[PDB]
Ligand binder design. Sequence first.
Ligand SMILES: [Zn+2]
Ligand SMILES: [Zn+2]
Length: 76
Amino acid sequence: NYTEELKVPPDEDCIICMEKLSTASGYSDVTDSKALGSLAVGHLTKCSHAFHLLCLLAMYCNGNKDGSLQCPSCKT
Ligand SMILES: [Zn+2]
Ligand SMILES: [Zn+2]
């Protein structure tokens, strides 16, 4: 993960699959997950929010191109 991981999922709820941050990544079905498996909650250091890491890595191919992912919440 590239964002300060959280021993436990917050109550912000994912923003990609729009699912509870407790459950898991909704795109886990079809996603180019590298090492985010499908159960890692991390708040992007950029803004510092929270979202299914894996999920982000999905749409991350659009923005925040460097070596991590972008924040789906505030498009950070
Ligand atoms: Zn998600
Ligand atoms: Zn954000």
